[PDB]
Design a binder for this molecule. Structure first.
Ligand SMILES: [Zn+2]
Ligand SMILES: [Zn+2]
Ligand SMILES: [Zn+2]
Ligand SMILES: [Zn+2]
Ligand SMILES: [Zn+2]
Ligand SMILES: [Zn+2]
Lengths: 70, 70
C-alpha cells in the first residue's frame, strides 16, 4: 500500500514526470531511491509540503513504486 | 501543513470536486468532517489507498482545509 510520508514547507522530494499521473504527484526521497527511475524525467522539487504517493496507482505508475510498496 | 493519513485497499475517503486540484486528490474522513464543504460536489470514494492531501495547496484549495491544517 501507500507510503504517505509527509514533508514540510522547505523539505525536498522527488517529481518523476515518467511515473506521475499528474504534475502534482511526488514521492519521498527514500521511496525514490528504493525504486528504478534510471532514464526517467525526474527532478528534486520543493512543494510546500505533501504526502508521498508511492504505492498509490491512481497517482503513480506501479513500475515506479519502491521495493517496500509493491 | 499536510495530513497524509493513509487509507487502504477497501477504506473510504472523500473526494471533493469543488476543492480538488485534480480528480486524483482525496482527504481522510476526519479532515473532511473538520472542514466546510456544505455546497460542494463531494462524494465518498474507495480509491485503492492513498494519503490525505489536506494541508497541501498544490493539491487542494485552502478554504477546503480542515481546522487542524490551516
Ligand atoms: Zn515514500
Ligand atoms: Zn515507496
Ligand atoms: Zn520514474
Ligand atoms: Zn487528513
Ligand atoms: Zn486536515
Ligand atoms: Zn470541498
Amino acid at each position: 500500500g501507500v507510503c504517505g510520508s509527509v514533508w514540510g514547507q522547505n523539505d525536498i522530494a522527488y517529481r518523476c514526470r515518467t511515473c506521475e499521473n499528474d504534475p502534482t504527484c511526488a514521492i519521498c526521497v527514500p521511496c525514490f531511491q528504493n525504486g528504478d527511475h534510471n532514464s526517467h524525467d525526474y527532478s528534486i522539487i520543493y512543494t510546500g509540503g505533501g504526502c508521498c504517493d508511492c504505492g498509490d496507482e491512481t497517482a503513480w505508475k506501479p513500475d515506479g513504486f519502491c521495493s517496500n510498496h509493491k
